[PDB]
């Protein structure tokens, strides 16, 4: 293949660092980027390295450079939710029985359930008071 001309051959390729000025982009004075994109030839042609990749029509044409524009303790949370929890009733139905609208008790219980899920267990809404009280006893 034709020997790709070196960026020193042209010379005067000042290593400019400014990316853009006045909105318009600043082209690099060095042909390293253009050579990487597609190599020159021995006589100043532009055999372009075939871009074999996924199509992304937004990226290939960026609108002509577009416009250039605390958690409580686990034991504490369990104890509080148990205090908010009516006898022989899960957390979910506890949301139900207080959802026929004390409001403050309702959103307190819902929030407790929510960060309890955030802890890493998603079976919160499917546990009766007996199971979670047994869990509290096990951890206590």
Partner 1 sequence: NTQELLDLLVKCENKIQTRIKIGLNSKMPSRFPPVVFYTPKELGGLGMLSMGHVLI
Partner 2 sequence: VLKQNPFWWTHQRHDGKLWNLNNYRTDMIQALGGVEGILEHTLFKGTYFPTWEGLFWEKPNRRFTLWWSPTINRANVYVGFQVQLDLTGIFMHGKIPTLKISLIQIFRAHLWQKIHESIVMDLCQVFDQELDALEIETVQKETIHPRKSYKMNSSCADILLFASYKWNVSRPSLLADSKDVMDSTTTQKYWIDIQLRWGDYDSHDIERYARAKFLDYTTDNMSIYPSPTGVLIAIDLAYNLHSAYGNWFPGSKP
Partner 3 sequence: EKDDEEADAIYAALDKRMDERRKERREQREKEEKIQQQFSDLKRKLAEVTEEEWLSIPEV
Q: How far is the CB of 63 from partner 1 (least distance, A)?
A: 16
Site for partner 1, residues 10 to 39, rule: CB under 8 A: 38
- Cβ distance 48 to 38 under 8 Å? yes
Residues 70 and 73: their CA atoms lie apart, in Å, by 9
| Binding residues with partner 2: total (CB under 8 A) | 27
Check residue 42 and report its DSSP letter: T
Residue 93 in 3-state DSSP?
helix
Nearer to partner 1, 31 or 94 (CB): 31
Residues 28 and 11: their CA atoms lie apart, in Å, by 13
10, 48, 65, 86: which one binds partner 1 (CB under 8 A):
48
The reply to whether 22 sits near partner 2 by the rule CB under 8 A is: yes
Q: Which residues bind partner 2 (CB under 8 A)?
A: 10-14, 16, 18, 21-29, 31, 34, 38, 40, 43-46, 61, 64-65
């Amino acid at each position: 293949k034709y020997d790709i001309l070196a960026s020193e051959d042209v010379e005067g390729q000042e290593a400019a660092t400014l990316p853009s000025e006045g909105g318009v982009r600043i082209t690099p004075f060095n042909l390293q980027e253009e050579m990487e994109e597609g190599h020159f030839d021995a006589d100043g042609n532009y055999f372009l390295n075939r871009d074999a990749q996924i199509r992304d029509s937004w990226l290939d044409n960026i609108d002509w450079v577009k416009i250039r524009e605390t958690s409580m303790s686990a034991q504490a949370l369990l104890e509080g939710l148990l205090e908010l929890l009516l006898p022989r009733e899960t957390v979910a139905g506890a949301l139900r029985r207080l959802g026929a609208r004390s409001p403050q008790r309702l959103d307190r219980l819902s929030g407790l359930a929510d960060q309890m899920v955030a802890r890493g267990n998603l079976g919160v809404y499917q546990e009766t008071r007996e199971r979670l009280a047994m869990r509290l006893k096990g951890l206590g």
